[PDB]
Amino acid sequence: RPNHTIYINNLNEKIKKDELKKSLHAIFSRFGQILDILVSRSLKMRGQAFVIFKEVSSATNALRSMQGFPFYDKPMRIQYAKTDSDIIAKM
RNA sequence: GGUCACGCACAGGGCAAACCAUUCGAAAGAGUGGGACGCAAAGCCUCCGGCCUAAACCAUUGCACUCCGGUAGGUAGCGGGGUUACCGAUGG
Ligand SMILES: [Mg+2]
Ligand SMILES: [Mg+2]
Ligand SMILES: [Mg+2]
Numbered sequence: 001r002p003n004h005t006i007y008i009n010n011l012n013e014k015i016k017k018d019e020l021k022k023s024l025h026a027i028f029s030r031f032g033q034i035l036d037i038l039v040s041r042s043l044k045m046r047g048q049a050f051v052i053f054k055e056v057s058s059a060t061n062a063l064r065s066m067q068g069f070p071f072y073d074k075p076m077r078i079q080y081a082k083t084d085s086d087i088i089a090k091m
Numbered sequence: 092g093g094u095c096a097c098g099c100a101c102a103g104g105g106c107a108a109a110c111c112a113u114u115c116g117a118a119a120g121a122g123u124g125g126g127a128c129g130c131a132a133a134g135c136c137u138c139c140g141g142c143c144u145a146a147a148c149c150a151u152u153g154c155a156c157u158c159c160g161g162u163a164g165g166u167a168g169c170g171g172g173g174u175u176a177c178c179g180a181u182g183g
Contacts, residue, residue, distance in 0.1 A: 005154095005155095007154060007155085009152065009153080009154090010152060011152095013151085016145090036156090038155065038156065040155075040156095041145085042153095042155095042158085042159065042160080043150090043151065043153080043159080043160040043161090044151090044153055044154090044155080044159085044160085045153070045154085045155060046151070046152090046153070046160095047151085047152065047153070048152085048153065048154075048155075050154080050155065050156085077152085079154095081154065081155085082154055082155095083154080083155090084156095085155085085156060086156060
């Protein structure tokens, strides 16, 4: 169940990619070092974000701390990622 | 000479990237002036593919790590295709 990556759902789609990453970064750095923040404004990936943490305990901490946090008008819907990939476990 | 091509020239020359100033645009970018990296159509046209933008509207609650909604705008100096044209190697 737990993961290095957290899947943030239900984001304000009107925000630019530039600012969205920057804001999420300013929000989620409180919990540990972030490897990357993936954000895409494609039809399939709109209103979604992946924060990849250095540590899983950091991810668990951020999820449990900021569930339903009012963020650009809307509460974030955080849940662990299904699979991590990137540069986590070999791939 | 005309036509279809061709660019190893000749001659008249033409256009003008980056950058800068300025204007319009939400942006990509375009216009004008300066300026030349290049260009045998770097004249012109978004019909076909690519790539860039995303303010508005419509749709989407979507689990990605190749990249991708509609819509609209841009690139003709990203290809293709359409169309117009100067010179003419005893030129093919
Ligand atoms: Mg960080
Ligand atoms: Mg000029
Ligand atoms: Mg045009």
